Amino acid sequence: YVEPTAPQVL
């Protein structure tokens, strides 16, 4: 299973 990811808010 892959965990969803997104770029961190800076």
Residues engaged in binding other proteins (CB under 8 A) = 2-9
Q: Which helix (H) or strand (E) holds 9?
A: none
Min dist. Cβ of residue 3 to other proteins (A): 7
Min dist. Cβ of residue 4 to other proteins (A): 4
Min dist. Cβ of residue 9 to other proteins (A): 5
DSSP secondary-structure letter at 4? P
What letters, b where the CB count within 10 A reaches 16 and e where it falls short, cover 1-10?
Answer: eeeeeeeeee
